[PDB]
């Protein structure tokens, strides 16, 4: 139940500085007052990050997705290869109540959307879903910015999340904050592309970065919270 959207909305492919964001806890081992060096997938410091002011973007190996969303317009994510019933597809949606995670051979048209009426109930994102794989429900994830890291390693989908109030207007804050592990999904999908969901009114700023394998040095404080990090290959001083 969807139609081709005549209004070809255009979001300029802005480029900005990544600064020092995109650090997550690599494991579950508590440490205190120690400097630990580890090699893993991470977003390189001071990289070039793409800002959209809803096309198809390749998944690559890892995705750092950030949104300074106001009033929770961002809804969910779509993952797959061709986004049709021919191949397994993954869908995450954060509706008014507890979230939904569903893996099926979902059929998508050009411009899927959720829409709302002014009681609030409208769901015609897809057209068909014949064979499903996994179903999961948990607490809803949702001026205030939300950062997510998606990793698909060894049949495990790791989602690291962190939300923080922001008072700066447009640019990314120049600060440091770790990303605690939120969700582990024990389902393996050969993803290559992903989409985005918007809460259109039936009656737009986000940042995308990619991960690379490199070595970091992390400092643990007394309570076990990461407070400082260094990239190994950024500068002779580093």
């Amino acid at each position: 139940q969807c139609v081709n959207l005549t209004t070809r909305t255009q979001l300029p492919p802005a480029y900005t500085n990544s600064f020092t964001r995109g650090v997550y806890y690599p494991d579950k081992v508590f440490r205190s007052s120690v400097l630990h060096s580890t090699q893993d997938l991470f977003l390189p410091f001071f990289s070039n990050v793409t800002w959209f002011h809803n096309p198809v973007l390749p998944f690559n190996d890892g995705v750092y997705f950030a949104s300074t969303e106001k009033s929770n317009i961002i809804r969910g994510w779509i993952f797959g290869t061709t986004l049709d019933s021919k191949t397994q597809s993954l869908l995450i949606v954060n509706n008014a109540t507890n979230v939904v995670i569903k893996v099926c051979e979902f059929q998508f048209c050009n411009d899927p959307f959720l829409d709302v009426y002014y009681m609030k109930s409208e769901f015609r994102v897809y057209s068909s879903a014949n064979n499903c794989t996994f179903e999961y429900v948990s607490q809803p994830f949702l001026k205030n910015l939300r950062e997510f890291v998606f990793k698909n390693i060894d049949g495990y989908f790791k989602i690291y999340s962190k939300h923080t109030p922001i008072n700066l207007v447009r640019d990314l804050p120049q600060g440091f904050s770790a990303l605690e592990p939120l969700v582990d999904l024990p389902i393996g999908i050969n993803i290559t592309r992903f989409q985005t969901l918007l809460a259109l009114h039936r009656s737009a700023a986000y940042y995308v970065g990619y991960l690379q394998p490199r070595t970091f040095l992390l400092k643990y404080n007394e309570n076990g919270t990461i407070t400082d990090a260094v990239d190994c290959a950024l500068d002779p001083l580093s």
Binding site: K28, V29, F30, R31, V34, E180, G224
Partner: protein, 366 residues
């Protein structure tokens, strides 16, 4: 002991080091999570139909209690062999992410299921990693998978550009260009279908009867435990040198309440050099603490076999609270170097004959 260590029947005056003292563990404790649901294993093992070798069936099982004794002792299986774990220890370990893969092959292809194995099924249909850990089961299915009319539903991949990566699935069925010209969906010369069928018949002899093969693959300490074997958990003991078996992680030490501030997603902390310090019991979720049981070398002070035959014994760096063969022999003195038994403390001060340490030393009078 001094005579034995010095290999001499006479010993001159001085202090010598014989052996080392250490506290012994008293009892054992087991702490396993509140899980008792049975694990469905016969559903995948006693299933009526199994998928083809090129489309082998895969299942993931978790949040269950599985007994491997009932699978090992059964003689219905033709081949039972494991790689990473001895079968008798399987019941004693707790794993996560158990994978069961089921498929059907021929009699002569059973050798193909092995790390670093070269053949046809091992590299064109199913590839096993070199560092695979787990176990493999096989059995005969002639009485059920063989039809007098001939079974051709069982097919295997025969043609591909290259070999298959381990744990990689292939379902694509496209014509193979065996020459230098495109086939364009024509199966003529230098064009063969990638799939080859089977001729399973009851009259066929050994080496061609249908065989059903399943594999079991595990992981080693990558996440909190979810599937264990049949075990019983005991309670907790505080301030006691005991050996613990927390969630399959085994150690020895003394358990004390700790004031460390974890976060709701860790399981066990540490300090440095892979030294586990604090753990969280699955049943109670308490921040415990681990401290090694005390030890240290022992020394004997003697004035020489020429003079007498009485000695003093020093335990180095040990609190004079847990001394014990000679515990109730004489007075006990507490020093900065440890505890000393067999000598008397005096308020005088003479020259030093046999240095002990921390600025104090002993002599013979007693």
């Amino acid at each position: 002991e001094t005579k034995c260590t010095l290999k001499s029947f006479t010993v001159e005056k001085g202090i010598y080091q014989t052996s080392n003292f250490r506290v012994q563990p008293t009892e054992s404790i087991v702490r396993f999570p509140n899980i008792t649901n049975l694990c469905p294993f016969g559903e995948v093992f006693n299933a009526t139909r199994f998928a083809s070798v090129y489309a082998w069936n895969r299942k993931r099982i978790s949040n269950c209690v599985a007994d491997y004794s009932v699978l090992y002792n059964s003689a219905s299986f033709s081949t039972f062999k494991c790689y990473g774990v001895s079968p008798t220890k399987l019941n004693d370990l707790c794993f996560t992410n158990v994978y069961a893969d089921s498929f059907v092959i021929r009699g002569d292809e059973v050798r193909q299921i092995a790390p670093g194995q070269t053949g046809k099924i091992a590299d064109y249909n199913y590839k096993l990693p070199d560092d695979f850990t787990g176990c493999v089961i096989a059995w005969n299915s002639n009485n059920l998978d063989s039809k007098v009319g001939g079974n051709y539903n069982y097919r295997y991949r025969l043609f591909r550009k290259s070999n298959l990566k381990p744990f990689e699935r292939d379902i694509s069925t496209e014509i193979y260009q065996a020459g230098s010209t495109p086939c364009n969906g024509v199966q003529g010369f230098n064009c063969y279908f990638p799939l080859q069928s089977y001729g399973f018949q009851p009259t066929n002899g050994v080496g061609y009867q249908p065989y059903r093969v399943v594999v079991l693959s595990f992981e080693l300490l990558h996440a909190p435990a979810t599937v264990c074997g049949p075990k019983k958990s005991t309670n907790l003991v505080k301030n006691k040198c005991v050996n613990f078996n927390f969630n399959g992680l085994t150690g020895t030490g003394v358990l004390t309440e700790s004031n460390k501030k974890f976060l709701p997603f860790q399981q066990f902390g540490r300090d440095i050099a892979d030294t586990t310090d604090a753990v969280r019991d699955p049943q109670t979720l308490e921040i415990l603490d681990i401290t090694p049981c005390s030890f240290g070398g022992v020394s004997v002070i003697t004035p020489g076999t020429n003079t007498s035959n009485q000695v003093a014994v020093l335990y180095q760096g040990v609190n004079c609270t847990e001394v014990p063969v000679y515990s109730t022999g004489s007075n006990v003195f507490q020093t900065r170097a440890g505890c000393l038994i067999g000598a008397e403390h005096v308020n005088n001060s003479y020259e030093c004959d046999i240095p002990i340490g921390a600025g104090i030393c002993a002599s013979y009078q007693s």
